[PDB]
From Swiss-Prot, chains A, B:
Function: Plays a central role in virus morphogenesis and assembly. Acts as a viroporin and self-assembles in host membranes forming pentameric protein-lipid pores that allow ion transport. Also plays a role in the induction of apoptosis. Regulates the localization of S protein at cis-Golgi, the place of virus budding. May act by slowing down the cell secretory pathway. May interfere with tight-junction stability by interacting with host MPP5. This would result in disruption of epithelial barriers, thereby amplifying inflammatory processes.
GO annotation terms (biological process): disruption of cellular anatomical structure in another organism; symbiont-mediated perturbation of host cell endomembrane system; viral budding from Golgi membrane
Any one annotated GO CC term: membrane
Signal peptide residues on this chain, from the entry's feature table: none
UniProt gene name: E
GO MF, any single term: identical protein binding
Record carries keyword Membrane: yes
Protein family membership: Belongs to the betacoronaviruses E protein family.
Cell location: Host Golgi apparatus membrane
Whole sequence portion shown: 12 to 37 of 75
Record protein name field: Envelope small membrane protein
Record note on quaternary structure: Homopentamer. Interacts via C-terminus PDM domain with PDZ domain-containing host proteins such as PALS1/MPP5, TJP1/ZO1, LNX2, PARD3, and AFDN/MLLT4. This may lead to disruption of tight junctions between epithelial cells. Interacts with membrane protein M in the budding compartment of the host cell, which is located between endoplasmic reticulum and the Golgi complex. Interacts with Nucleoprotein.
Length: 26, 26
């Protein structure tokens, strides 16, 4: 459970950061 | 322990997609 939790929340930072970079690109 | 590892590896994806996305963007 704790590895799955940390991983997923990190996977949310991953999505944020692509998104903030492609908004800034567009 | 394992939470640091999975976190550092998701942290590497974090740099990878941000430098991929800036590489594509610019």
């Amino acid at each position: 459970l704790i590895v799955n939790s940390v991983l997923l929340f990190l996977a949310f930072v991953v999505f944020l950061l692509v998104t903030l970079a492609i908004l800034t690109a567009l």
